[PDB]
CSV table of C-alpha atoms and ligand atoms in Angstrom, one decimal:
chain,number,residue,atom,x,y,z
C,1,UNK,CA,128.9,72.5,240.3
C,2,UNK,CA,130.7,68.9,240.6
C,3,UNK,CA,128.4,66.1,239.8
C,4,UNK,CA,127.6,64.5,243.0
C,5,UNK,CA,126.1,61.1,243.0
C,6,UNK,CA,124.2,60.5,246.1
C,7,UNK,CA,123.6,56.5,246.8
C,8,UNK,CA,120.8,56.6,249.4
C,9,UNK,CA,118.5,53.4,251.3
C,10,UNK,CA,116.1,54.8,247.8
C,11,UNK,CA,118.2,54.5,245.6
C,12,UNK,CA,120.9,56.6,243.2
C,13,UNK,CA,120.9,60.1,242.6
C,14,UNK,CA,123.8,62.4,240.6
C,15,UNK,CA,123.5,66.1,241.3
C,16,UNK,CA,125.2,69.3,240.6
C,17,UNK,CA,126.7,71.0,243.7
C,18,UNK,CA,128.4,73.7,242.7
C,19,UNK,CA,131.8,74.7,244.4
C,20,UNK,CA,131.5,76.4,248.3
C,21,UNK,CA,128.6,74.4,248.8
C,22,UNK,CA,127.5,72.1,251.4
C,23,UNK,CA,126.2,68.8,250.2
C,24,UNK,CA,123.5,69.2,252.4
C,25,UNK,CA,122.4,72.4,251.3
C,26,UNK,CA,122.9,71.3,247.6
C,27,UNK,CA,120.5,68.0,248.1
C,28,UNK,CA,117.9,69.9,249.7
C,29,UNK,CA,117.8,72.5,246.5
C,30,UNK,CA,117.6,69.5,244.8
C,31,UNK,CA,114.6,68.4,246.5
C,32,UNK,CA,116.4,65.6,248.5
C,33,UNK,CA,115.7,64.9,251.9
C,34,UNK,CA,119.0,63.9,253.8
C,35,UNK,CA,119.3,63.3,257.8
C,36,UNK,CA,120.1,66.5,259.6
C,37,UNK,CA,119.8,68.0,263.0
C,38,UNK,CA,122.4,70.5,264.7
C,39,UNK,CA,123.9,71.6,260.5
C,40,UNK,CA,126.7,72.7,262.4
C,41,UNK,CA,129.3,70.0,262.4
C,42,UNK,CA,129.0,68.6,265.6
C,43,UNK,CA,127.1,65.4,265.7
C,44,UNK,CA,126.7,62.5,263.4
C,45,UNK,CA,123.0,62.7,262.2
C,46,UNK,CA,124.3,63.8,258.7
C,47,UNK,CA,126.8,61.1,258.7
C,48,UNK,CA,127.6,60.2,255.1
C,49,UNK,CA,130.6,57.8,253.6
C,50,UNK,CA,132.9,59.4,250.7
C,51,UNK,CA,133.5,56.7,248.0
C,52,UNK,CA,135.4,58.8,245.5
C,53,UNK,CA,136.0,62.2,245.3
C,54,UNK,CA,137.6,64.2,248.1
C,55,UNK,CA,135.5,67.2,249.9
C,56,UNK,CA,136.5,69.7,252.6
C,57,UNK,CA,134.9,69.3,255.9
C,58,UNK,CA,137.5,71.3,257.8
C,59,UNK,CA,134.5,72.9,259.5
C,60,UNK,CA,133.8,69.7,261.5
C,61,UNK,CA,134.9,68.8,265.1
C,62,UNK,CA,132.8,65.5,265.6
C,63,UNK,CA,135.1,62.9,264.1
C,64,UNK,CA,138.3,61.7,264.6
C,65,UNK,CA,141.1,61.2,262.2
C,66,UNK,CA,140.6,57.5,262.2
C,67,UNK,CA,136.7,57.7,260.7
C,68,UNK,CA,137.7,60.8,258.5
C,69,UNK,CA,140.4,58.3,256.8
C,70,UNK,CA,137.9,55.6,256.7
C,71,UNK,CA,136.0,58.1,254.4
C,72,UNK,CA,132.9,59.0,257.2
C,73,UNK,CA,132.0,63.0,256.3
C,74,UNK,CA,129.5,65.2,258.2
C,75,UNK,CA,127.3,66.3,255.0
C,76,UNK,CA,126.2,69.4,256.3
C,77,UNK,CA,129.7,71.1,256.3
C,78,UNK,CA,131.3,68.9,253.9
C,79,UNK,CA,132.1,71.0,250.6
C,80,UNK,CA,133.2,69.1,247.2
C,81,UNK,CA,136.6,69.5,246.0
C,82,UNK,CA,135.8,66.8,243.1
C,83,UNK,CA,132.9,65.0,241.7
C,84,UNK,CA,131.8,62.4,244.0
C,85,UNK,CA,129.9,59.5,245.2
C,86,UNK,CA,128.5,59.5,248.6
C,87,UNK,CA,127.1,57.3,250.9
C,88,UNK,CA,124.4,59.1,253.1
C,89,UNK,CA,122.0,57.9,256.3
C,90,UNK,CA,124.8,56.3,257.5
C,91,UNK,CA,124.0,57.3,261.0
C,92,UNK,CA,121.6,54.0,260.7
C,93,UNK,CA,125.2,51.9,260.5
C,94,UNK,CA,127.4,52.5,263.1
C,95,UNK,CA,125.2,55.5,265.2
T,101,FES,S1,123.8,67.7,261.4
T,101,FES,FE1,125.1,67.6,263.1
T,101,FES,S2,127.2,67.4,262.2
T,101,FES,FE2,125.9,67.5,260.4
């Protein structure tokens, strides 16, 4: 649903994900393949960085306020509120 640009180590990519949808789940429709392992909110291995755009990721309980205002998301739970640009693998920064 809102365009989504993904900026990944390969490069750009702008997809659709529609509204109540995880980016995660979204990407991987699209074909992408974007770090993952418990899907549940709890870890950083889908570790992503919002640029623009704002997303809901209410689900989460792995970071604290002071990464969420830095703009650090958990992909798999995060859920567009806006188009946006989005960092991902950023686990491979910062574990
Ligand atoms: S894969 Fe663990 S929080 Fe997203």
């Amino acid at each position: 649903a809102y365009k989504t640009v993904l900026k990944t180590p390969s490069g750009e990519f702008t997809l659709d994900v529609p509204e109540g949808t995880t980016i995660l789940d979204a990407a991987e429709e699209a074909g992408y393949d974007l770090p993952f392992s418990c899907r549940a909110g709890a870890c950083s291995s889908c570790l992503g960085k919002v640029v623009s755009g704002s997303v809901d990721e209410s689900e989460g309980s792995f970071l604290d306020d002071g990464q969420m205002e830095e703009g650090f998301v958990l992909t798999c739970i995060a859920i567009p509120e806006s188009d946006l640009v989005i960092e991902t693998h950023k686990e491979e920064e910062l574990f």
